[PDB]
mmCIF file of N, CA, C and O in Angstrom:
data_model
loop_
_atom_site.group_PDB
_atom_site.id
_atom_site.type_symbol
_atom_site.label_atom_id
_atom_site.label_comp_id
_atom_site.label_asym_id
_atom_site.label_seq_id
_atom_site.Cartn_x
_atom_site.Cartn_y
_atom_site.Cartn_z
ATOM 1 N N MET A 1 -146.579 48.226 86.958
ATOM 2 C CA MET A 1 -146.642 48.447 85.506
ATOM 3 C C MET A 1 -146.969 49.912 85.224
ATOM 4 O O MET A 1 -148.086 50.244 84.850
ATOM 5 N N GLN A 2 -146.015 50.820 85.456
ATOM 6 C CA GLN A 2 -146.200 52.252 85.232
ATOM 7 C C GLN A 2 -145.165 52.749 84.220
ATOM 8 O O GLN A 2 -144.104 52.139 84.070
ATOM 9 N N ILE A 3 -145.467 53.829 83.507
ATOM 10 C CA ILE A 3 -144.626 54.478 82.499
ATOM 11 C C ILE A 3 -144.698 55.976 82.830
ATOM 12 O O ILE A 3 -145.477 56.370 83.706
ATOM 13 N N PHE A 4 -143.878 56.831 82.212
ATOM 14 C CA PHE A 4 -143.934 58.253 82.507
ATOM 15 C C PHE A 4 -143.789 59.071 81.228
ATOM 16 O O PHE A 4 -142.893 58.826 80.426
ATOM 17 N N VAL A 5 -144.612 60.106 81.065
ATOM 18 C CA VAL A 5 -144.555 60.982 79.891
ATOM 19 C C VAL A 5 -144.288 62.396 80.385
ATOM 20 O O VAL A 5 -144.801 62.789 81.438
ATOM 21 N N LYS A 6 -143.456 63.144 79.664
ATOM 22 C CA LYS A 6 -143.090 64.522 79.944
ATOM 23 C C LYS A 6 -143.423 65.274 78.667
ATOM 24 O O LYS A 6 -142.875 64.983 77.604
ATOM 25 N N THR A 7 -144.312 66.247 78.772
ATOM 26 C CA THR A 7 -144.755 67.061 77.660
ATOM 27 C C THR A 7 -143.843 68.279 77.542
ATOM 28 O O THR A 7 -143.285 68.747 78.545
ATOM 29 N N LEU A 8 -143.707 68.836 76.339
ATOM 30 C CA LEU A 8 -142.882 70.019 76.101
ATOM 31 C C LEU A 8 -143.418 71.234 76.888
ATOM 32 O O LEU A 8 -142.651 72.108 77.282
ATOM 33 N N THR A 9 -144.710 71.240 77.232
ATOM 34 C CA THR A 9 -145.407 72.280 77.991
ATOM 35 C C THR A 9 -144.911 72.377 79.449
ATOM 36 O O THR A 9 -145.351 73.257 80.188
ATOM 37 N N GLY A 10 -144.061 71.458 79.920
ATOM 38 C CA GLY A 10 -143.523 71.448 81.278
ATOM 39 C C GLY A 10 -144.483 70.850 82.309
ATOM 40 O O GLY A 10 -144.027 70.125 83.201
ATOM 41 N N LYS A 11 -145.792 71.103 82.164
ATOM 42 C CA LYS A 11 -146.856 70.616 83.046
ATOM 43 C C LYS A 11 -146.736 69.112 83.234
ATOM 44 O O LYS A 11 -146.473 68.400 82.263
ATOM 45 N N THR A 12 -146.927 68.626 84.454
ATOM 46 C CA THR A 12 -146.845 67.204 84.747
ATOM 47 C C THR A 12 -148.182 66.565 84.365
ATOM 48 O O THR A 12 -149.197 66.862 84.992
ATOM 49 N N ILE A 13 -148.212 65.764 83.301
ATOM 50 C CA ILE A 13 -149.385 65.063 82.800
ATOM 51 C C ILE A 13 -148.913 63.606 82.713
ATOM 52 O O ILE A 13 -148.089 63.255 81.867
ATOM 53 N N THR A 14 -149.437 62.765 83.595
ATOM 54 C CA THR A 14 -149.127 61.355 83.767
ATOM 55 C C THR A 14 -150.171 60.399 83.178
ATOM 56 O O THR A 14 -151.323 60.790 82.953
ATOM 57 N N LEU A 15 -149.723 59.213 82.751
ATOM 58 C CA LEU A 15 -150.551 58.151 82.172
ATOM 59 C C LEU A 15 -150.222 56.770 82.752
ATOM 60 O O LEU A 15 -149.214 56.601 83.441
ATOM 61 N N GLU A 16 -151.127 55.813 82.548
ATOM 62 C CA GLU A 16 -151.047 54.421 82.965
ATOM 63 C C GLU A 16 -151.197 53.611 81.670
ATOM 64 O O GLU A 16 -152.169 53.799 80.928
ATOM 65 N N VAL A 17 -150.196 52.793 81.334
ATOM 66 C CA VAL A 17 -150.161 51.971 80.126
ATOM 67 C C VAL A 17 -149.618 50.590 80.527
ATOM 68 O O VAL A 17 -148.748 50.501 81.400
ATOM 69 N N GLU A 18 -150.092 49.534 79.868
ATOM 70 C CA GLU A 18 -149.710 48.142 80.117
ATOM 71 C C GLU A 18 -148.510 47.736 79.250
ATOM 72 O O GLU A 18 -148.268 48.365 78.223
ATOM 73 N N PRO A 19 -147.768 46.662 79.585
ATOM 74 C CA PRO A 19 -146.627 46.217 78.778
ATOM 75 C C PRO A 19 -147.058 45.787 77.368
ATOM 76 O O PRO A 19 -146.277 45.890 76.423
ATOM 77 N N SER A 20 -148.297 45.314 77.240
ATOM 78 C CA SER A 20 -148.921 44.858 76.013
ATOM 79 C C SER A 20 -149.390 46.009 75.119
ATOM 80 O O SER A 20 -149.856 45.739 74.011
ATOM 81 N N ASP A 21 -149.335 47.262 75.566
ATOM 82 C CA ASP A 21 -149.804 48.375 74.753
ATOM 83 C C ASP A 21 -148.764 48.804 73.730
ATOM 84 O O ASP A 21 -147.549 48.618 73.890
ATOM 85 N N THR A 22 -149.260 49.411 72.653
ATOM 86 C CA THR A 22 -148.424 49.908 71.582
ATOM 87 C C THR A 22 -148.409 51.430 71.705
ATOM 88 O O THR A 22 -149.401 52.040 72.114
ATOM 89 N N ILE A 23 -147.301 52.069 71.334
ATOM 90 C CA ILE A 23 -147.169 53.522 71.413
ATOM 91 C C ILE A 23 -148.211 54.177 70.499
ATOM 92 O O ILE A 23 -148.630 55.306 70.765
ATOM 93 N N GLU A 24 -148.624 53.493 69.425
ATOM 94 C CA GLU A 24 -149.632 53.988 68.497
ATOM 95 C C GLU A 24 -150.927 54.310 69.265
ATOM 96 O O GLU A 24 -151.562 55.330 69.015
ATOM 97 N N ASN A 25 -151.315 53.473 70.230
ATOM 98 C CA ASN A 25 -152.516 53.736 71.013
ATOM 99 C C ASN A 25 -152.283 54.922 71.958
ATOM 100 O O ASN A 25 -153.141 55.797 72.104
ATOM 101 N N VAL A 26 -151.097 54.977 72.569
ATOM 102 C CA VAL A 26 -150.687 56.017 73.505
ATOM 103 C C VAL A 26 -150.698 57.390 72.819
ATOM 104 O O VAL A 26 -151.257 58.343 73.366
ATOM 105 N N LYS A 27 -150.084 57.544 71.633
ATOM 106 C CA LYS A 27 -150.079 58.837 70.939
ATOM 107 C C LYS A 27 -151.519 59.249 70.667
ATOM 108 O O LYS A 27 -151.865 60.401 70.931
ATOM 109 N N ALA A 28 -152.366 58.328 70.207
ATOM 110 C CA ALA A 28 -153.760 58.615 69.918
ATOM 111 C C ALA A 28 -154.486 59.108 71.171
ATOM 112 O O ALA A 28 -155.262 60.056 71.073
ATOM 113 N N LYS A 29 -154.195 58.543 72.354
ATOM 114 C CA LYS A 29 -154.840 58.943 73.607
ATOM 115 C C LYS A 29 -154.652 60.436 73.850
ATOM 116 O O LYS A 29 -155.615 61.134 74.179
ATOM 117 N N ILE A 30 -153.416 60.927 73.711
ATOM 118 C CA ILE A 30 -153.130 62.339 73.912
ATOM 119 C C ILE A 30 -153.693 63.179 72.762
ATOM 120 O O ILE A 30 -154.240 64.253 73.011
ATOM 121 N N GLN A 31 -153.536 62.730 71.507
ATOM 122 C CA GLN A 31 -154.036 63.483 70.357
ATOM 123 C C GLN A 31 -155.547 63.682 70.437
ATOM 124 O O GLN A 31 -156.024 64.761 70.098
ATOM 125 N N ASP A 32 -156.292 62.698 70.942
ATOM 126 C CA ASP A 32 -157.744 62.772 71.091
ATOM 127 C C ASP A 32 -158.128 63.925 72.010
ATOM 128 O O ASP A 32 -159.073 64.656 71.729
ATOM 129 N N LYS A 33 -157.364 64.143 73.081
ATOM 130 C CA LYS A 33 -157.614 65.206 74.046
ATOM 131 C C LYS A 33 -157.433 66.577 73.396
ATOM 132 O O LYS A 33 -158.012 67.558 73.862
ATOM 133 N N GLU A 34 -156.621 66.662 72.347
ATOM 134 C CA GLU A 34 -156.304 67.884 71.627
ATOM 135 C C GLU A 34 -157.010 68.011 70.256
ATOM 136 O O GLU A 34 -156.967 69.089 69.660
ATOM 137 N N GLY A 35 -157.679 66.961 69.751
ATOM 138 C CA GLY A 35 -158.407 66.951 68.476
ATOM 139 C C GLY A 35 -157.547 67.227 67.239
ATOM 140 O O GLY A 35 -158.033 67.831 66.280
ATOM 141 N N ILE A 36 -156.273 66.839 67.264
ATOM 142 C CA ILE A 36 -155.291 67.058 66.198
ATOM 143 C C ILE A 36 -154.739 65.769 65.571
ATOM 144 O O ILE A 36 -154.779 64.711 66.206
ATOM 145 N N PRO A 37 -154.191 65.845 64.341
ATOM 146 C CA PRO A 37 -153.609 64.690 63.673
ATOM 147 C C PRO A 37 -152.251 64.383 64.320
ATOM 148 O O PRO A 37 -151.553 65.306 64.748
ATOM 149 N N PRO A 38 -151.811 63.115 64.341
ATOM 150 C CA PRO A 38 -150.540 62.745 64.949
ATOM 151 C C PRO A 38 -149.345 63.255 64.146
ATOM 152 O O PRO A 38 -148.237 63.326 64.676
ATOM 153 N N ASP A 39 -149.559 63.665 62.900
ATOM 154 C CA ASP A 39 -148.551 64.200 61.995
ATOM 155 C C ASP A 39 -147.971 65.482 62.602
ATOM 156 O O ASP A 39 -146.842 65.867 62.303
ATOM 157 N N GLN A 40 -148.739 66.174 63.454
ATOM 158 C CA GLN A 40 -148.341 67.406 64.119
ATOM 159 C C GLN A 40 -147.480 67.136 65.368
ATOM 160 O O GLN A 40 -146.962 68.098 65.941
ATOM 161 N N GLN A 41 -147.282 65.877 65.790
ATOM 162 C CA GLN A 41 -146.487 65.528 66.969
ATOM 163 C C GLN A 41 -145.382 64.513 66.675
ATOM 164 O O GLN A 41 -145.372 63.845 65.637
ATOM 165 N N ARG A 42 -144.423 64.417 67.594
ATOM 166 C CA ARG A 42 -143.290 63.503 67.526
ATOM 167 C C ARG A 42 -142.892 63.071 68.937
ATOM 168 O O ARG A 42 -143.218 63.766 69.902
ATOM 169 N N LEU A 43 -142.225 61.927 69.067
ATOM 170 C CA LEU A 43 -141.754 61.354 70.325
ATOM 171 C C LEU A 43 -140.280 61.010 70.141
ATOM 172 O O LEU A 43 -139.898 60.502 69.084
ATOM 173 N N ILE A 44 -139.451 61.243 71.159
ATOM 174 C CA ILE A 44 -138.009 60.964 71.104
ATOM 175 C C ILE A 44 -137.568 60.271 72.391
ATOM 176 O O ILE A 44 -137.968 60.687 73.487
ATOM 177 N N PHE A 45 -136.765 59.211 72.277
ATOM 178 C CA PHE A 45 -136.244 58.459 73.413
ATOM 179 C C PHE A 45 -134.801 58.053 73.115
ATOM 180 O O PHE A 45 -134.492 57.611 72.010
ATOM 181 N N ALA A 46 -133.922 58.180 74.111
ATOM 182 C CA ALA A 46 -132.496 57.878 74.045
ATOM 183 C C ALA A 46 -131.830 58.488 72.801
ATOM 184 O O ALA A 46 -131.078 57.815 72.088
ATOM 185 N N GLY A 47 -132.157 59.750 72.510
ATOM 186 C CA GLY A 47 -131.620 60.505 71.385
ATOM 187 C C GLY A 47 -132.092 60.038 70.006
ATOM 188 O O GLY A 47 -131.592 60.573 69.012
ATOM 189 N N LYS A 48 -133.051 59.103 69.920
ATOM 190 C CA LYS A 48 -133.582 58.553 68.671
ATOM 191 C C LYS A 48 -135.079 58.819 68.549
ATOM 192 O O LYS A 48 -135.794 58.894 69.551
ATOM 193 N N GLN A 49 -135.571 58.851 67.315
ATOM 194 C CA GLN A 49 -136.965 59.083 66.991
ATOM 195 C C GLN A 49 -137.762 57.835 67.379
ATOM 196 O O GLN A 49 -137.380 56.709 67.036
ATOM 197 N N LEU A 50 -138.815 57.993 68.181
ATOM 198 C CA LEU A 50 -139.649 56.862 68.561
ATOM 199 C C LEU A 50 -140.527 56.652 67.323
ATOM 200 O O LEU A 50 -141.394 57.482 67.024
ATOM 201 N N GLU A 51 -140.273 55.574 66.588
ATOM 202 C CA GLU A 51 -141.002 55.249 65.376
ATOM 203 C C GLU A 51 -142.420 54.804 65.729
ATOM 204 O O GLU A 51 -142.624 54.060 66.689
ATOM 205 N N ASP A 52 -143.401 55.289 64.971
ATOM 206 C CA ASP A 52 -144.819 54.974 65.123
ATOM 207 C C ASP A 52 -145.064 53.467 64.931
ATOM 208 O O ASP A 52 -144.354 52.809 64.168
ATOM 209 N N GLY A 53 -146.045 52.902 65.642
ATOM 210 C CA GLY A 53 -146.423 51.492 65.568
ATOM 211 C C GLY A 53 -145.640 50.500 66.438
ATOM 212 O O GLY A 53 -145.960 49.312 66.370
ATOM 213 N N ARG A 54 -144.648 50.901 67.248
ATOM 214 C CA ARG A 54 -143.885 49.932 68.064
ATOM 215 C C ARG A 54 -144.592 49.647 69.391
ATOM 216 O O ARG A 54 -145.501 50.383 69.786
ATOM 217 N N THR A 55 -144.173 48.596 70.101
ATOM 218 C CA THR A 55 -144.771 48.206 71.376
ATOM 219 C C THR A 55 -143.751 48.350 72.507
ATOM 220 O O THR A 55 -142.539 48.378 72.253
ATOM 221 N N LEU A 56 -144.224 48.484 73.750
ATOM 222 C CA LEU A 56 -143.367 48.601 74.918
ATOM 223 C C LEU A 56 -142.621 47.282 75.064
ATOM 224 O O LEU A 56 -141.420 47.269 75.312
ATOM 225 N N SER A 57 -143.340 46.173 74.886
ATOM 226 C CA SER A 57 -142.825 44.829 74.980
ATOM 227 C C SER A 57 -141.713 44.580 73.949
ATOM 228 O O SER A 57 -140.649 44.079 74.319
ATOM 229 N N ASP A 58 -141.915 44.982 72.688
ATOM 230 C CA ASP A 58 -140.947 44.786 71.606
ATOM 231 C C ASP A 58 -139.671 45.600 71.783
ATOM 232 O O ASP A 58 -138.578 45.072 71.572
ATOM 233 N N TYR A 59 -139.796 46.867 72.195
ATOM 234 C CA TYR A 59 -138.643 47.741 72.406
ATOM 235 C C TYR A 59 -138.068 47.577 73.823
ATOM 236 O O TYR A 59 -137.098 48.249 74.179
ATOM 237 N N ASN A 60 -138.612 46.659 74.630
ATOM 238 C CA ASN A 60 -138.201 46.367 76.002
ATOM 239 C C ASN A 60 -138.298 47.600 76.907
ATOM 240 O O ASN A 60 -137.401 47.830 77.727
ATOM 241 N N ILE A 61 -139.341 48.428 76.771
ATOM 242 C CA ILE A 61 -139.484 49.612 77.614
ATOM 243 C C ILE A 61 -139.660 49.157 79.067
ATOM 244 O O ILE A 61 -140.452 48.251 79.365
ATOM 245 N N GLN A 62 -138.848 49.737 79.951
ATOM 246 C CA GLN A 62 -138.838 49.470 81.380
ATOM 247 C C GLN A 62 -139.842 50.405 82.071
ATOM 248 O O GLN A 62 -140.349 51.352 81.461
ATOM 249 N N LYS A 63 -140.160 50.156 83.346
ATOM 250 C CA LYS A 63 -141.084 51.022 84.076
ATOM 251 C C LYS A 63 -140.448 52.404 84.243
ATOM 252 O O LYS A 63 -139.223 52.538 84.145
ATOM 253 N N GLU A 64 -141.263 53.423 84.504
ATOM 254 C CA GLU A 64 -140.857 54.822 84.692
ATOM 255 C C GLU A 64 -139.992 55.382 83.549
ATOM 256 O O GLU A 64 -139.369 56.439 83.710
ATOM 257 N N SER A 65 -139.969 54.720 82.389
ATOM 258 C CA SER A 65 -139.187 55.154 81.252
ATOM 259 C C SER A 65 -139.883 56.414 80.758
ATOM 260 O O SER A 65 -141.099 56.422 80.551
ATOM 261 N N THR A 66 -139.102 57.480 80.608
ATOM 262 C CA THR A 66 -139.609 58.763 80.180
ATOM 263 C C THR A 66 -139.880 58.759 78.678
ATOM 264 O O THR A 66 -139.107 58.209 77.887
ATOM 265 N N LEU A 67 -140.949 59.440 78.288
ATOM 266 C CA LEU A 67 -141.403 59.626 76.923
ATOM 267 C C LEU A 67 -141.460 61.141 76.780
ATOM 268 O O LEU A 67 -142.010 61.815 77.655
ATOM 269 N N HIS A 68 -140.838 61.697 75.743
ATOM 270 C CA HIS A 68 -140.801 63.133 75.503
ATOM 271 C C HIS A 68 -141.829 63.426 74.421
ATOM 272 O O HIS A 68 -141.566 63.220 73.235
ATOM 273 N N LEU A 69 -142.997 63.898 74.848
ATOM 274 C CA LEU A 69 -144.125 64.221 73.988
ATOM 275 C C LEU A 69 -143.964 65.660 73.503
ATOM 276 O O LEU A 69 -144.053 66.607 74.297
ATOM 277 N N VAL A 70 -143.742 65.829 72.204
ATOM 278 C CA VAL A 70 -143.558 67.115 71.557
ATOM 279 C C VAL A 70 -144.678 67.253 70.537
ATOM 280 O O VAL A 70 -144.837 66.424 69.640
ATOM 281 N N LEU A 71 -145.428 68.344 70.664
ATOM 282 C CA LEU A 71 -146.567 68.708 69.839
ATOM 283 C C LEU A 71 -146.742 70.229 69.898
ATOM 284 O O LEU A 71 -145.930 70.922 70.523
ATOM 285 N N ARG A 72 -147.783 70.756 69.258
ATOM 286 C CA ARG A 72 -148.129 72.173 69.184
ATOM 287 C C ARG A 72 -149.509 72.379 69.803
ATOM 288 O O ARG A 72 -150.506 71.886 69.269
ATOM 289 N N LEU A 73 -149.575 73.061 70.944
ATOM 290 C CA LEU A 73 -150.808 73.367 71.654
ATOM 291 C C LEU A 73 -151.634 74.274 70.756
ATOM 292 O O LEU A 73 -151.187 75.372 70.431
ATOM 293 N N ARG A 74 -152.788 73.815 70.284
ATOM 294 C CA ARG A 74 -153.661 74.602 69.431
ATOM 295 C C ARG A 74 -154.224 75.717 70.308
ATOM 296 O O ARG A 74 -154.908 75.439 71.298
ATOM 297 N N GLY A 75 -153.917 76.959 69.960
ATOM 298 C CA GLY A 75 -154.320 78.173 70.644
ATOM 299 C C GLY A 75 -153.550 79.325 70.010
ATOM 300 O O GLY A 75 -152.897 79.140 68.975
ATOM 301 N N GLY A 76 -153.615 80.507 70.617
ATOM 302 C CA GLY A 76 -152.932 81.703 70.155
ATOM 303 C C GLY A 76 -153.939 82.785 69.886
ATOM 304 O O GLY A 76 -154.451 83.353 70.872
#
């Protein structure tokens, strides 16, 4: 039961999520590490916008399915 996330930063940052988890919890996990609102980030899969509030189980997400995490690294 593994999934895979690829951040726009290129750096390999991996996570462990269950089939019963919702992407809403997953986005929050990363946003918490950065202390930013989720409005500042977006997710895209199979050329479509990953809509907030869906589940891996509902969208039939398979193992090792890539998630493209796009956000703005607070710094500068």
